[model samples]
Target: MIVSFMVAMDENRVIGKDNNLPWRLPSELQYVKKTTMGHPLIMGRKNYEAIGRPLPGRRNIIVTRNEGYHVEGCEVAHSVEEVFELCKNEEEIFIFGGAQIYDLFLPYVDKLYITKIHHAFEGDTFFPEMDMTNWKEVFVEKGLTDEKNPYTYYYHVYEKQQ
Candidate 1:
């Protein structure tokens, strides 16, 4: 299965504030939902807790070190290797993340689905910088800003260099 990432960040690389997303961009959220609807998603426990429930139409795999940890309607993985095992038969899988989860899976990630917000925001969590030489942009689409989603954002897809 192809290892991938699904995340959003602002100009400052800020991803979270107060343990939640830093911005309210409905269009970006919809883009993520539409993109990963049928794929399995791997996320750390903190990220899962931030979301608060299993997202519909996908396999939710929560990674934690707790041996007896369990969540209804979700599978728990103790290591990154276990996550790969769980998705062995799939065509692609997305890492739905917080900072630590992103860091943990960065080495194996082959594809990235990123939403770039045009503005900066205050946040305690940030996405790690990508080594551009090791990646190639595959596609990008501009998102329209409306009354509800006030931020200018663009969706980008990247592939790791061979």
Candidate 2:
């Protein structure tokens, strides 16, 4: 099975601020829904709580250290291996995130779909630097969003070299 990560990062590799995104880009949200719909998405408890509920049309798995914590409509896994066990028979699984969760699963991820925002933000969360030596950019599309928030960004897909 292929383990993968999907996230949008700012110029400084920031992923979030105060458990929320720094900007509002509906297109990016749509893109996320389109790509991950019907797949199993694994995220940290904070990330899941930030959204307030399980994402629609997907099997939502949250990794948390809190054994007593619970959210309706979502499954909890204590570790990466436990999460893997839940979806092991699937062809691919998407690791959605908060920084710590992404870092924990980085070594097992085979593909990355990154939305590179052109601007930076003051943030407490960031995506871990991916080793280019072990990854190759397979696709990229850069464009300026004409929406209310006008920021240029690129969507990129990378695959492990091996």
Candidate 3:
């Protein structure tokens, strides 16, 4: 199965503050939902708690060590391997984040879909650096949203070099 990640980060790789995104970019949010729709999404417990609900239209798989925790629209898997086992027969699986989830899944991911915001912000969560030598840019679209948000961002997709 192909593993992928979908996230939005700032120039300094800041992804969140206080369990929420530091900025609002409706277009980017829509992009994330569209790209991962109908696929299995693997995320860490913190990420699942932050959102507080299973994102609609996808199977939510939470990676956590807590054996008794459960959410109404989600399933809990104790490890990355367990998550993979749940999705092994699928064509592709998307790793949706909180930083911890991204770190654990990075080695297994074949592609990354990132919305690169142009400004930096004070954040408590961050996206891990991509090892450029192992990944090559495959697609890019740069633009600012017309919705009066204060950032200009670009959507970029990178594929691992085999």
Candidate 4:
């Protein structure tokens, strides 16, 4: 399967605070749904909890340390290797993450959709520092700023170089 990750971060790569998204960008949520729908999504257990139930349209795969951990409407994965195993015959896989999952899957993903907020926000959890040298920028679009979505932000797609 083609593995990929999607994240929305502030300028410093801050991804979360109190286990919830720090920003309220409706367009960003819509973009994530539009991009990952129909594909199986892999995430850490906490990420699953933050969002509550399984997202309606996609397969929900959660990775956790506890062997007995289980959630209704979701598949439990012990590791990223296991996730790949379960998705072997599939065409693509997506990592919808909390911090740890992002770090664990970063080296293996083929593509990444990163949304960059123009300003920084305080957060306890952060996305891993990226080496831009490793990726090919496939595309970028500047989103118009509004009251709910403050600061100009840009959406970018990057393909990992072979």
Local error of candidate 2 at residue 74 (angstroms): 0.7
Which one wins on lDDT?
1
Give the higher-lDDT candidate: 3 or 4. 4
lDDT of 1 by residue, 1-162 (tens): 688899899988899999978778777779889999999989888888888999999999999988999999899999998998998899999999888989999888899998888888887999977776768889988997999888878899998857
lDDT of 3 at 143: 58
Model 3 residue 150 CA deviation in Å: 3.7
Which segments of model 4 are wrong by more than 4 Å? none
* Count of clashing pairs, candidate 2: 0
Q: TM-scores across all candidates?
A: 0.96, 0.94, 0.93, 0.93
lDDT of 1: 0.88
Q: What is the C-alpha local distance difference test score of each model?
A: 0.88, 0.86, 0.85, 0.86
- lDDT for each residue of candidate 4 in 1-162, tens digit (9 for 90 to 100): 678888889888888889877778877788889989888989998888888889879989999978999999999999878998889888888889998998898778898888999887777898887765687889999876777766788989888768
- Preferred candidate (lDDT higher): 1 or 4: 1
Supply candidate 1's per-residue lDDT for 24. Answer: 81
Clashing pairs in 3: none
Off by over 4 Å in 1: none
Could you tell me the lDDT of residue 136 within candidate 1?
87
Worst 10 residues of 4 by lDDT: 143-152
Q: What tens digits encode model 2's per-residue C-alpha lDDT throughout 1-162?
A: 888899998989989889877887877877889889989999997788677888999999999978887888998998777887999788889889989988899879889989998988887899988785667889988754875657898988899858
Clash pairs detected, candidate 2: none
Error of 2 at 86 (Å): 0.7
